[PDB]
Symmetry: C2
């Protein structure tokens, strides 16, 4: 064999996000991925991490340059806060030239804090000439892929209309004291529109094999002050600012077939009492097709899939762990592409094969900028060329 | 002291009034009694008066003889909307020769355009009669309960709202028996004006708030419908529809800047995994949801879900075998009767429980509808807050 060596920036073996998605996944693929490097701001944390989980081949690097430069890395994975994506990726991309073996750059969604930073990063990566990857795992949910198979095989006929509803999670009336104030402040690349909506609206475009045409959005901050609550759920009688949106009304048209799409994303709690919190309701000429969850987060949720002299079918994987599962699949697809199981390439687009690159992430960003731009200007925007230039 | 009804549009075999107004008036025989009955062809009036044994019905020959008589207390216009202006304008004038006229009652839509609407309101307002508009949605038991709950803080303040409806006729197929006028532009009947109009009015009426900003997209993705017979088979022949077959609406309630998301489907196929009519209201202390299978709130038997009382009780409320086609209209009449006898002539109902929707309410509704189309054309969100004032 020949396991792809992984260099990890952001693997904290106690906190963060990667420890609960990437790590478990890499484990279950021990012959194809093995963690080699591990940079962190404080090198102490790297060693502590390498020790907690008995990473046999992990080597705690001291600086960014020593880490990005080593030849023991085949794929680099950036899993830190989005706010730090630009500061870290840009230099790292440069230092990595001293490594002839680098074959894969892997970054978590969102890619940056703004269209601009996004454009910069893509360029910096494209010119370096490495295969890029974006953690849009939505594209790997078994449910998302089935829905895609069905729709592309004319199983529901042509699409007539579409409704969507999601939940951002954190942006309701209350905030727990333990939650970092950075996910509630503007400009940090994490929020209801960029993160939650971004993921979902990408799966949609990916399921239906169509980018958007015209769109119009309205972005709300009707909870400027959240009420602090403890663990039990009680209030400490203290309000803290949120400058980040707590509701999104999106609305537009798929380029293919001028298909109406209606969207509503709820900030957070309370949850919906009489409707699933995540819903993708696709309506066709020969049938319907609908995905439900209780999370609001498609990318890491276990869904149910319904799809209609009529024959209705429901499809559900009982006890399927989507938090690890979808990520796992993404890795599995990287491995498949590497050992040539089933050419370096620029973007996945609507293809089944391969995986979402940074180019896909970029286009997603162009759509997101449009959603905000549309809200500000208060006008429907033609967005057809977003996926070119 | 029965109220003497003059009916323009009561065809005792076809039309709409025969299946709503008529049955309702019957069940209120002591408070409403049909006296007059104008029609284009006086023959049809007599035929109608004869079919249903209307004891006091008098078939009038001309519009002027009908509008002018003193045997009418309330006039009810129930003809096609396309003919509302031609008929109402002159009739309003002739009716001056009748000192007893106390009520003008008109079916929604009121006119074919904002302009015609403005004209008619003026022509009515200056005549000085109490106007009424057939927005029966405001009388659905389900709509009134939802209104009680929301206004009593039962679901707390409103956080957000989703709506979904169905126009009925504007799918991929058209039956050969359906009049081509409901599929042509400019006739005051269509997915936006009619179906959306009714629903969006109930919303504003349930939540006691007009709109603030809105943005719409109006579709004609089926320009040619496929003709089908009774069984549902195709005659292999396509006919034009120039009227919308989908509406994306989206805006904000003036009260609490509440997001509202909307999607209205042209027609068939129906939705396989969701009710075809849905009003999903979300609050801070609870939710509240209305479902139907019709797509037409105003004439549908709904189910009402409402959690609340935060150790949290959910409740469902449904009137089994309640005929909404007749029921809602019936309620509207019942409320006119209540107001007349007094179980203070008034300009508009607004968000009040008491009374009934007047022509002023109909007008505002029209201003919103013009905005929806205007917004689609211009492709921009529109501030709409003053819609409910300006005595323009």
């Amino acid at each position: 064999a020949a396991p792809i060596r992984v260099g990890f920036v952001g693997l904290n073996a106690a906190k963060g996000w990667a420890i609960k998605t990437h790590y478990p996944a890499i484990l279950q693929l021990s012959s194809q991925f093995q963690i080699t490097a591990l940079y962190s701001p404080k090198i102490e944390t790297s060693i502590a991490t390498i020790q907690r989980l008995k990473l046999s081949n992990a080597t705690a690097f001291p600086t960014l340059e020593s880490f990005a430069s080593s030849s023991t890395i085949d794929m680099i994975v950036i899993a830190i806060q989005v706010a730090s994506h630009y500061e870290v990726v840009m230099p790292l991309l440069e230092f990595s030239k001293n490594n002839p073996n680098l074959k894969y750059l892997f970054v978590e969604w969102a890619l940056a804090c703004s269209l601009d930073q996004a454009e910069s990063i893509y360029k910096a990566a494209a010119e370096r000439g490495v295969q890029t990857i974006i953690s849009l795992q939505g594209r790997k949910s078994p449910y998302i892929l089935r829905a895609k198979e069905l729709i592309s095989q004319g199983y529901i006929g042509d699409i007539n209309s579409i409704e969507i509803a999601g939940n951002g999670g954190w942006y309701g009336y209350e905030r727990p004291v333990k939650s970092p104030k950075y996910i509630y402040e503007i400009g940090n690349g994490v929020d209801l529109v960029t993160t939650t909506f971004g993921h979902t609206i990408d799966i949609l475009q990916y399921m239906t094999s169509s980018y958007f045409s015209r769109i119009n959005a309205m972005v709300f901050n009707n909870i400027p002050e959240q009420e602090l609550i403890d663990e039990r759920g009680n209030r400490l009688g203290q309000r803290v600012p949120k400058t980040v949106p707590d509701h999104l009304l999106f609305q537009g048209t798929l380029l293919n077939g001028n298909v109406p799409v209606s969207c509503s994303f709820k900030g957070g709690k309370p949850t919906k009492k009489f409707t699933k919190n995540l819903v993708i309701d696709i309506h066709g000429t020969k049938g319907d097709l609908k995905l439900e969850g209780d999370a609001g987060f498609a990318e890491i949720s276990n869904l149910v899939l319904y799809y209609s002299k009529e024959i209705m079918k429901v499809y559900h994987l009982r006890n399927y762990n989507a938090i690890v599962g979808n990520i796992h699949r993404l890795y599995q697809s990287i491995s498949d592409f590497h050992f040539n199981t089933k050419s370096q390439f620029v973007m996945q687009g609507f293809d089944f094969e391969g995986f979402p690159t940074l180019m896909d992430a970029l286009i997603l960003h162009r759509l997101i900028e449009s959603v905000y731009k549309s809200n500000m200007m208060g006008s429907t925007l033609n967005v057809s060329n977003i996926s070119h230039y």
